[PDB]
mmCIF file of N, CA, C and O in Angstrom:
data_model
loop_
_atom_site.group_PDB
_atom_site.id
_atom_site.type_symbol
_atom_site.label_atom_id
_atom_site.label_comp_id
_atom_site.label_asym_id
_atom_site.label_seq_id
_atom_site.Cartn_x
_atom_site.Cartn_y
_atom_site.Cartn_z
ATOM 1 N N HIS A 1 -46.127 168.729 100.330
ATOM 2 C CA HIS A 1 -47.466 169.010 101.043
ATOM 3 C C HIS A 1 -48.510 168.617 100.003
ATOM 4 O O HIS A 1 -48.437 169.225 99.216
ATOM 5 N N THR A 2 -49.138 167.450 100.319
ATOM 6 C CA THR A 2 -50.493 167.028 99.265
ATOM 7 C C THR A 2 -51.413 167.719 100.179
ATOM 8 O O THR A 2 -51.904 167.049 101.270
ATOM 9 N N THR A 3 -52.691 167.987 99.167
ATOM 10 C CA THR A 3 -53.732 168.231 99.483
ATOM 11 C C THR A 3 -54.595 167.165 98.786
ATOM 12 O O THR A 3 -54.791 167.359 97.786
ATOM 13 N N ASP A 4 -55.809 166.660 99.675
ATOM 14 C CA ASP A 4 -56.440 165.862 98.937
ATOM 15 C C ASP A 4 -57.558 165.836 99.957
ATOM 16 O O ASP A 4 -57.934 165.926 100.924
ATOM 17 N N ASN A 5 -58.942 165.960 98.811
ATOM 18 C CA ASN A 5 -60.577 165.543 99.420
ATOM 19 C C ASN A 5 -61.060 164.575 98.716
ATOM 20 O O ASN A 5 -61.065 164.673 97.421
ATOM 21 N N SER A 6 -61.522 164.029 99.566
ATOM 22 C CA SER A 6 -62.376 162.784 99.064
ATOM 23 C C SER A 6 -64.086 162.854 99.650
ATOM 24 O O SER A 6 -64.295 163.327 100.677
ATOM 25 N N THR A 7 -64.906 162.648 98.431
ATOM 26 C CA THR A 7 -66.289 162.841 98.804
ATOM 27 C C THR A 7 -66.872 161.166 98.564
ATOM 28 O O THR A 7 -66.402 160.527 97.271
ATOM 29 N N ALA A 8 -67.718 160.661 99.071
ATOM 30 C CA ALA A 8 -68.631 159.381 98.726
ATOM 31 C C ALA A 8 -69.897 159.599 99.185
ATOM 32 O O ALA A 8 -70.341 159.812 100.220
ATOM 33 N N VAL A 9 -70.928 159.115 98.359
ATOM 34 C CA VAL A 9 -72.333 158.960 98.566
ATOM 35 C C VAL A 9 -72.739 157.365 98.363
ATOM 36 O O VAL A 9 -72.984 156.937 97.292
ATOM 37 N N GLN A 10 -72.760 156.448 99.822
ATOM 38 C CA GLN A 10 -73.277 155.216 99.724
ATOM 39 C C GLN A 10 -74.608 155.144 99.830
ATOM 40 O O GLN A 10 -75.032 155.805 100.749
ATOM 41 N N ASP A 11 -75.212 154.324 99.006
ATOM 42 C CA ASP A 11 -76.585 153.922 98.994
ATOM 43 C C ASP A 11 -76.541 152.426 99.391
ATOM 44 O O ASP A 11 -75.909 152.115 98.589
ATOM 45 N N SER A 12 -77.506 152.019 100.457
ATOM 46 C CA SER A 12 -77.931 150.877 100.571
ATOM 47 C C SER A 12 -79.296 150.474 100.894
ATOM 48 O O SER A 12 -80.043 151.562 101.227
ATOM 49 N N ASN A 13 -79.709 149.318 100.503
ATOM 50 C CA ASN A 13 -81.197 148.853 100.807
ATOM 51 C C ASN A 13 -81.036 147.246 100.919
ATOM 52 O O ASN A 13 -80.204 146.565 100.530
ATOM 53 N N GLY A 14 -82.099 146.714 101.902
ATOM 54 C CA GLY A 14 -81.916 145.304 102.461
ATOM 55 C C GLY A 14 -83.600 145.131 102.824
ATOM 56 O O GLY A 14 -84.191 146.072 102.661
ATOM 57 N N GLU A 15 -83.533 143.726 103.333
ATOM 58 C CA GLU A 15 -84.753 143.077 103.851
ATOM 59 C C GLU A 15 -84.444 142.434 104.592
ATOM 60 O O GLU A 15 -83.035 141.434 104.561
ATOM 61 N N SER A 16 -85.473 141.556 105.511
ATOM 62 C CA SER A 16 -85.124 140.620 106.427
ATOM 63 C C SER A 16 -86.405 139.716 106.593
ATOM 64 O O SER A 16 -87.507 140.252 106.139
ATOM 65 N N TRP A 17 -86.262 138.564 107.049
ATOM 66 C CA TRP A 17 -87.663 137.939 107.528
ATOM 67 C C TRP A 17 -87.111 136.869 108.906
ATOM 68 O O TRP A 17 -86.233 136.889 109.018
ATOM 69 N N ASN A 18 -88.284 136.815 109.428
ATOM 70 C CA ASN A 18 -88.148 136.089 111.100
ATOM 71 C C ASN A 18 -89.446 135.264 111.026
ATOM 72 O O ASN A 18 -90.510 135.580 110.516
ATOM 73 N N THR A 19 -89.313 134.266 111.580
ATOM 74 C CA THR A 19 -89.962 133.099 111.782
ATOM 75 C C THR A 19 -89.957 132.774 113.620
ATOM 76 O O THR A 19 -88.792 132.842 113.725
ATOM 77 N N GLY A 20 -91.174 132.817 114.265
ATOM 78 C CA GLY A 20 -90.918 132.404 115.575
ATOM 79 C C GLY A 20 -91.885 131.208 116.025
ATOM 80 O O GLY A 20 -92.774 130.903 115.328
ATOM 81 N N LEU A 21 -91.759 130.680 117.306
ATOM 82 C CA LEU A 21 -92.603 129.508 117.674
ATOM 83 C C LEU A 21 -92.280 129.671 119.333
ATOM 84 O O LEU A 21 -91.007 129.437 119.839
ATOM 85 N N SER A 22 -93.424 129.798 120.123
ATOM 86 C CA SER A 22 -93.253 130.345 121.693
ATOM 87 C C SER A 22 -94.365 128.907 122.009
ATOM 88 O O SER A 22 -95.509 128.943 121.746
ATOM 89 N N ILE A 23 -93.587 128.233 122.992
ATOM 90 C CA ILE A 23 -94.482 126.805 123.931
ATOM 91 C C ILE A 23 -94.316 126.944 125.173
ATOM 92 O O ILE A 23 -93.432 127.371 125.654
ATOM 93 N N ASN A 24 -95.696 126.509 125.804
ATOM 94 C CA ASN A 24 -95.818 126.933 127.513
ATOM 95 C C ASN A 24 -95.511 125.637 127.973
ATOM 96 O O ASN A 24 -96.487 124.314 127.491
ATOM 97 N N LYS A 25 -94.656 125.071 128.829
ATOM 98 C CA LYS A 25 -94.209 123.784 129.085
ATOM 99 C C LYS A 25 -95.192 123.341 130.473
ATOM 100 O O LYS A 25 -95.327 122.318 130.755
ATOM 101 N N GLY A 26 -96.091 124.238 130.914
ATOM 102 C CA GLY A 26 -97.040 123.821 131.658
ATOM 103 C C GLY A 26 -98.367 123.511 131.284
ATOM 104 O O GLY A 26 -98.994 122.664 131.670
ATOM 105 N N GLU A 27 -98.893 124.135 130.402
ATOM 106 C CA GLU A 27 -100.220 123.859 129.535
ATOM 107 C C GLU A 27 -99.746 124.036 127.932
ATOM 108 O O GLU A 27 -99.806 124.970 127.638
ATOM 109 N N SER A 28 -99.301 122.829 127.667
ATOM 110 C CA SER A 28 -98.864 122.489 126.275
ATOM 111 C C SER A 28 -99.808 122.130 125.163
ATOM 112 O O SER A 28 -99.833 122.389 124.185
ATOM 113 N N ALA A 29 -100.997 121.964 125.662
ATOM 114 C CA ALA A 29 -101.881 121.151 124.855
ATOM 115 C C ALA A 29 -103.402 121.029 125.658
ATOM 116 O O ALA A 29 -103.459 121.302 127.040
ATOM 117 N N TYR A 30 -104.532 120.727 124.994
ATOM 118 C CA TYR A 30 -106.084 120.917 125.390
ATOM 119 C C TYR A 30 -106.425 120.036 125.001
ATOM 120 O O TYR A 30 -106.293 119.395 123.487
ATOM 121 N N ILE A 31 -107.118 118.820 125.592
ATOM 122 C CA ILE A 31 -107.764 117.758 125.066
ATOM 123 C C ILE A 31 -109.303 117.677 125.006
ATOM 124 O O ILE A 31 -109.686 118.370 126.070
ATOM 125 N N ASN A 32 -109.799 116.892 124.307
ATOM 126 C CA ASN A 32 -111.581 116.836 124.179
ATOM 127 C C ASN A 32 -111.520 115.348 123.927
ATOM 128 O O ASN A 32 -111.343 114.854 123.116
ATOM 129 N N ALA A 33 -112.729 114.841 124.652
ATOM 130 C CA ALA A 33 -113.013 113.604 124.727
ATOM 131 C C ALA A 33 -114.554 113.831 124.096
ATOM 132 O O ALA A 33 -115.335 114.405 124.580
ATOM 133 N N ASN A 34 -114.943 112.427 123.250
ATOM 134 C CA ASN A 34 -116.271 112.476 122.655
ATOM 135 C C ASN A 34 -116.604 110.945 123.249
ATOM 136 O O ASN A 34 -116.140 109.856 123.576
ATOM 137 N N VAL A 35 -117.806 111.181 124.462
ATOM 138 C CA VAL A 35 -118.176 110.101 125.347
ATOM 139 C C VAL A 35 -119.807 109.916 125.241
ATOM 140 O O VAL A 35 -120.763 110.665 124.438
ATOM 141 N N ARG A 36 -120.310 108.831 125.368
ATOM 142 C CA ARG A 36 -121.718 108.552 125.424
ATOM 143 C C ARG A 36 -122.118 107.958 126.745
ATOM 144 O O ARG A 36 -121.137 107.183 127.626
ATOM 145 N N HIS B 1 -39.933 161.453 106.419
ATOM 146 C CA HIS B 1 -40.506 162.068 107.663
ATOM 147 C C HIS B 1 -41.719 162.356 107.308
ATOM 148 O O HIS B 1 -41.819 163.746 106.761
ATOM 149 N N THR B 2 -43.023 161.532 107.017
ATOM 150 C CA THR B 2 -43.905 162.183 106.689
ATOM 151 C C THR B 2 -45.283 162.415 107.467
ATOM 152 O O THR B 2 -45.311 161.479 108.410
ATOM 153 N N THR B 3 -45.894 163.415 107.536
ATOM 154 C CA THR B 3 -46.807 163.596 108.584
ATOM 155 C C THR B 3 -48.315 164.124 107.869
ATOM 156 O O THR B 3 -48.146 165.343 107.322
ATOM 157 N N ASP B 4 -49.577 163.407 108.307
ATOM 158 C CA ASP B 4 -50.785 163.615 107.609
ATOM 159 C C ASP B 4 -51.784 163.655 108.560
ATOM 160 O O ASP B 4 -51.590 162.689 109.566
ATOM 161 N N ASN B 5 -52.638 164.326 108.469
ATOM 162 C CA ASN B 5 -53.788 164.431 109.420
ATOM 163 C C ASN B 5 -54.875 164.161 108.537
ATOM 164 O O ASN B 5 -55.342 165.011 107.577
ATOM 165 N N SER B 6 -55.723 162.925 108.970
ATOM 166 C CA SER B 6 -57.011 162.846 108.187
ATOM 167 C C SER B 6 -58.154 163.290 109.078
ATOM 168 O O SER B 6 -58.468 162.223 110.033
ATOM 169 N N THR B 7 -59.125 163.914 108.623
ATOM 170 C CA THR B 7 -60.354 164.197 109.130
ATOM 171 C C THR B 7 -61.481 163.970 108.224
ATOM 172 O O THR B 7 -61.411 164.557 107.237
ATOM 173 N N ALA B 8 -62.572 163.429 108.743
ATOM 174 C CA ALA B 8 -63.515 162.857 107.768
ATOM 175 C C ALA B 8 -65.003 163.310 108.560
ATOM 176 O O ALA B 8 -65.125 162.882 109.650
ATOM 177 N N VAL B 9 -65.672 163.829 108.036
ATOM 178 C CA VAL B 9 -67.149 164.157 108.615
ATOM 179 C C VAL B 9 -68.250 163.302 107.612
ATOM 180 O O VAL B 9 -68.437 163.311 106.297
ATOM 181 N N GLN B 10 -68.906 162.572 108.466
ATOM 182 C CA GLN B 10 -69.908 161.437 107.746
ATOM 183 C C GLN B 10 -71.274 161.722 108.452
ATOM 184 O O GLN B 10 -71.630 161.739 109.470
ATOM 185 N N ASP B 11 -72.149 161.907 107.360
ATOM 186 C CA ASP B 11 -73.571 162.178 108.151
ATOM 187 C C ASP B 11 -74.426 161.288 107.077
ATOM 188 O O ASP B 11 -74.357 161.183 105.627
ATOM 189 N N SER B 12 -75.434 160.790 107.692
ATOM 190 C CA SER B 12 -76.320 159.590 107.273
ATOM 191 C C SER B 12 -77.282 159.571 107.840
ATOM 192 O O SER B 12 -77.719 160.267 108.800
ATOM 193 N N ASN B 13 -78.424 158.473 107.070
ATOM 194 C CA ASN B 13 -79.783 158.797 107.765
ATOM 195 C C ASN B 13 -80.292 157.461 106.933
ATOM 196 O O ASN B 13 -79.937 156.985 106.052
ATOM 197 N N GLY B 14 -81.765 156.987 107.723
ATOM 198 C CA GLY B 14 -82.452 155.922 106.713
ATOM 199 C C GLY B 14 -83.832 156.050 107.403
ATOM 200 O O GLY B 14 -84.065 156.718 107.986
ATOM 201 N N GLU B 15 -84.137 154.838 107.133
ATOM 202 C CA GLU B 15 -85.841 154.497 107.453
ATOM 203 C C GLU B 15 -86.196 152.988 107.103
ATOM 204 O O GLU B 15 -85.085 152.350 106.750
ATOM 205 N N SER B 16 -87.186 152.307 107.945
ATOM 206 C CA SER B 16 -87.447 150.985 107.819
ATOM 207 C C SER B 16 -88.710 150.813 107.856
ATOM 208 O O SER B 16 -89.896 151.517 108.303
ATOM 209 N N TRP B 17 -89.173 149.727 107.528
ATOM 210 C CA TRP B 17 -90.834 149.166 107.526
ATOM 211 C C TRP B 17 -90.466 147.982 108.065
ATOM 212 O O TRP B 17 -89.376 147.265 108.034
ATOM 213 N N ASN B 18 -91.923 147.361 108.771
ATOM 214 C CA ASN B 18 -92.081 146.071 109.407
ATOM 215 C C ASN B 18 -93.192 145.776 109.094
ATOM 216 O O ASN B 18 -94.392 146.375 109.195
ATOM 217 N N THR B 19 -93.640 144.532 109.137
ATOM 218 C CA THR B 19 -94.871 143.803 108.758
ATOM 219 C C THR B 19 -94.744 142.584 109.863
ATOM 220 O O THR B 19 -94.069 141.582 109.364
ATOM 221 N N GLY B 20 -95.711 142.388 110.632
ATOM 222 C CA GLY B 20 -95.900 141.043 111.358
ATOM 223 C C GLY B 20 -97.505 140.517 111.225
ATOM 224 O O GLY B 20 -98.036 140.882 111.069
ATOM 225 N N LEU B 21 -97.239 139.165 111.920
ATOM 226 C CA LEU B 21 -98.704 138.493 111.644
ATOM 227 C C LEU B 21 -98.273 137.271 112.728
ATOM 228 O O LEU B 21 -97.363 136.348 112.614
ATOM 229 N N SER B 22 -98.992 137.312 114.061
ATOM 230 C CA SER B 22 -99.002 135.882 114.663
ATOM 231 C C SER B 22 -100.592 135.581 115.269
ATOM 232 O O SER B 22 -101.480 136.159 114.819
ATOM 233 N N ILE B 23 -100.248 134.330 115.124
ATOM 234 C CA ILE B 23 -101.227 133.407 115.350
ATOM 235 C C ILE B 23 -101.429 132.186 116.384
ATOM 236 O O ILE B 23 -100.161 131.764 116.818
ATOM 237 N N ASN B 24 -102.462 131.646 117.312
ATOM 238 C CA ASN B 24 -102.588 131.179 118.278
ATOM 239 C C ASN B 24 -103.227 129.612 117.986
ATOM 240 O O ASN B 24 -103.859 129.607 117.134
ATOM 241 N N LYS B 25 -102.165 128.585 118.154
ATOM 242 C CA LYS B 25 -102.559 127.231 117.340
ATOM 243 C C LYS B 25 -103.680 126.726 118.309
ATOM 244 O O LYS B 25 -104.386 125.949 117.637
ATOM 245 N N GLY B 26 -103.734 126.911 119.351
ATOM 246 C CA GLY B 26 -104.822 126.147 120.128
ATOM 247 C C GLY B 26 -106.580 126.806 120.005
ATOM 248 O O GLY B 26 -107.039 126.081 119.878
ATOM 249 N N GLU B 27 -106.394 128.420 119.708
ATOM 250 C CA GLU B 27 -107.745 128.926 119.134
ATOM 251 C C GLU B 27 -107.198 129.722 117.976
ATOM 252 O O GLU B 27 -106.761 130.693 118.245
ATOM 253 N N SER B 28 -107.208 129.294 116.906
ATOM 254 C CA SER B 28 -107.167 129.751 115.588
ATOM 255 C C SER B 28 -108.078 130.697 115.017
ATOM 256 O O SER B 28 -108.070 131.662 114.399
ATOM 257 N N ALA B 29 -109.526 130.514 115.613
ATOM 258 C CA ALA B 29 -110.607 131.140 114.971
ATOM 259 C C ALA B 29 -111.677 130.825 116.205
ATOM 260 O O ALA B 29 -111.910 130.078 116.620
ATOM 261 N N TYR B 30 -113.060 131.769 115.985
ATOM 262 C CA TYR B 30 -114.276 131.472 116.448
ATOM 263 C C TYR B 30 -115.036 131.585 115.938
ATOM 264 O O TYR B 30 -115.109 131.670 114.496
ATOM 265 N N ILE B 31 -116.290 130.433 116.118
ATOM 266 C CA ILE B 31 -117.305 130.280 115.381
ATOM 267 C C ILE B 31 -118.671 130.493 115.888
ATOM 268 O O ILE B 31 -118.758 130.833 117.003
ATOM 269 N N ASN B 32 -119.538 131.063 114.922
ATOM 270 C CA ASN B 32 -120.589 131.338 115.388
ATOM 271 C C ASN B 32 -121.757 130.569 114.663
ATOM 272 O O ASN B 32 -122.016 130.781 113.474
ATOM 273 N N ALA B 33 -123.070 130.363 115.230
ATOM 274 C CA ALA B 33 -124.020 129.801 114.580
ATOM 275 C C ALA B 33 -125.256 130.120 114.529
ATOM 276 O O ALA B 33 -125.636 130.929 115.582
ATOM 277 N N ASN B 34 -125.979 130.478 113.508
ATOM 278 C CA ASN B 34 -127.548 130.971 113.134
ATOM 279 C C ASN B 34 -128.238 129.636 113.066
ATOM 280 O O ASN B 34 -128.403 129.107 112.091
ATOM 281 N N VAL B 35 -129.235 129.777 114.387
ATOM 282 C CA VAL B 35 -129.900 128.519 114.389
ATOM 283 C C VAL B 35 -131.509 129.024 114.291
ATOM 284 O O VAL B 35 -131.645 130.346 114.555
ATOM 285 N N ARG B 36 -132.253 128.058 114.740
ATOM 286 C CA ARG B 36 -134.004 128.337 114.821
ATOM 287 C C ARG B 36 -134.488 127.297 115.502
ATOM 288 O O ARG B 36 -134.177 126.013 115.147
#
């Protein structure tokens, strides 16, 4: 008969990054005209 | 014939931070003119 006790203190840290891009296919750009 | 029972109690906690920044390419800024 074996008696065992286990303790552990796990410490972690981290970071993350994200980049996004959303486009509308109905009105995708606006045009400006220079006229005389 | 070996018989063992393993019982473990795990307690954990954490925290997080976040920072964001969104921009519209069509209208990235507004301008104002001081005229006379």
